[PDB]
Amino acid sequence: TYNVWNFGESNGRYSALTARGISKETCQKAGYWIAKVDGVMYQVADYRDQNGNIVSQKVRDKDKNFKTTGSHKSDALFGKHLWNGGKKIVVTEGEIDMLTVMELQDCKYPVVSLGHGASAAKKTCAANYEYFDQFEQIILMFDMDEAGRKAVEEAAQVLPAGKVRVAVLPCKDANECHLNGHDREIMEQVWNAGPWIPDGVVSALSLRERIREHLSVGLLFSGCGINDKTLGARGGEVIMVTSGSGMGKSTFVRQQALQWGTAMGKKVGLAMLQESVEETAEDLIGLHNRVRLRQSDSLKREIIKFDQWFDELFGNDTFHLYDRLLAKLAYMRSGLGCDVIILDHISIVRKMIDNLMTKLKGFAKSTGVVLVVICHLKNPDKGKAHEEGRPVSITDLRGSGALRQLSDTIIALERNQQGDMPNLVLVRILKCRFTGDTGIAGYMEYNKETGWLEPS
Template sequence: MRHHYQWIDRFDKVTLIFDGDETGREWAQRAAALLPPGKGYIGEIIGHKDARSALMAGDGRAIQSAFFNAEKFVPQGIFRVKDLIAEARRPVERGIPWCLPGLTKITFGRRYGELYTLGAGNSIGKTDLTTQCISYDALSLGIMTAVIYLEQPPVETLKRLAGKIAGRPFHIPVEDLPEDERYSQQELDEALDRLEASPNLIFAGNFESTAWDDVEKKIRYLVISEGVKIVYLDNMTALVDETNERASVEGIIKKMALLCQELNIIIMLLCHLATPDGKPHEEGGQVSLRHFKGSRAMGAFPHYAFGLERNTQHEVPEYRNYSILRCVKDRYTGRYNGATISLHYDVASGQLVERDLPDDYYGDREEGSGGHRRGDIPPWEPDVGGPLEL
């Protein structure tokens, strides 16, 4: 067609009539996209597979109708106000809640078709937080949820999930636990039975393949065949080609965001962070968007990016159970960039709950703490939350 473009351009209207099946419609769209803009029209012969079938049946009028009733080709993604106004008139509704009320408040809930990322240093607690989210989504909300942890065996993930709903650390040998944290086989069995009874939880991935193409195929299968609506993927580093990290991250994160839109699902992607210039993340260093590996792409495609901060070396042992969840990117409204939610790990319930940091958490330092302090909580900050009820 390229060699005859100027000749084709002489005509005011070029009508394409392909086969009336799915393949014919697809190729009619492709061919029309190559024609001079505004001149392509697509017709379809009603009641027959193609023009030959219509002629063989003596139905020449069907071919004439296909020509005169052909519709002007418009590339996908182009709309007039009349195409959108009915949906635009609908009131905006809050999205799907998170397991943390404060997080629901600053994001207005989660929306299908969106990609969320969570970054943290090593052993800060991002897997524990998402495990709590998974339990909430599958059991409390009843949403079909897939868990793809590329660096953790599915059995361990299952035990951690059971621990979340029972408030017991089932993934730790019972004899190595303090007396008040020990659990019985009956407690483990009851929690596992409850998870088995739920139809809303499915696992995929166990070190067997960390190539994005393979993971994407799994997600497509889970969505189409199993009805999955929310995917938790841990973690980005496992997917990246280390020989060309930047290009690999940019390619994967773009495809992941587009996949969310195409399949109308939510993906929560866990990410490792680059080493910061100042205080290490493992000592409570503040998370910034630039700490995400491939930060340029991470800033462009996810709808929200969160950072989890915790001082695992705090001089007061109990204060090591406090962490800060920081919104480092708010694409939806922009008004909650930098918003923080302080969390406390409640050993008795095994849950992360929203709770203000202790007054002396940062000692005598008033400036440069790089974190959340009592007394300077903005008006939109959440109230103190209680243990998650599942």
């Protein structure tokens, strides 16, 4: 913090690292050493510019703290001053990894490292584009974490193209594979790696067996078409149902909840926030027995044989209703063993919607549960509304725009409300990550007397 620590004023000594696996020669070649100041031994690494002048110190203690000695630049790499060219470099994530690579390669290859890590890799890799021109191949060696995959994915835009390969590791990074005796598998990852292939560039050579797989399901959907196109629902998917106000989102998701608890036999955990708990159960009882219940006054008091219709469909422990919310859903997943989690309204729950969607995506990634989330649309500025038969685009998502970047499939419904008939819906798939194909799925009618969306 104060000034650049001289070894004379701090009792500098070059030693080895027994508990980490680095000898004294590698730290002597790099510049990593240990000072004795303030009683507690402080480890310290040295940074040098292109010329070779001492420009920065990195001070760490036995309890993993950070102490920058002054103005830390963005073009300072740990291991940059010693090499000024070559044909193959190895980019690591930390500083002990670069020492491990120098130990396992007998100080031969030009090996550099980052000074920020997976948090600020873009800032230290965008401004260092002029240094990477004198190289021929780059081997990225990141962590086997989520942040390492995020860093190697977001580092695809600031690096030169056609030269950089990515290697994989079974450990966290190179150091535990050095400790567990995997010194024969790291050299094959340095010498051989894989190309980028970022998300859309599929070469024709890599279709040797994918066409044969094409020339060879999951949870099905009720009512016509949908399951023929998106191949049903899978574990970990986040299904979105977007329509206009009054288009029948709750009836559709309630019919999907009924046919997944009486035929598939899976535990379904409901969460209705638009209404009370004494109404959705009556709606399920009316939906199962083919007779509409909540819209007839005489039949509500005629049957009160009510217990027979109750234990015919609620006789098991299948359904779980509900009257901060993430702990409730985590109890519904773990403590009850539910397979389907339905969230009816999200706007009553900018920065709030994004954080909520990241938290739900992390929950669905950790647990692996079928998750249905219902939201609403925007308000169109020119033309007809979504209730007279205007097709829903993927842009019109109510709230912060990021409802489509963290989802997996989107199903929309359209019907002419003030028209010639209101009982002929159109189902539109807007996005499917697995299958890919979009568009019109089928046509269903409502059948006003019963309440089942039978196909037509």
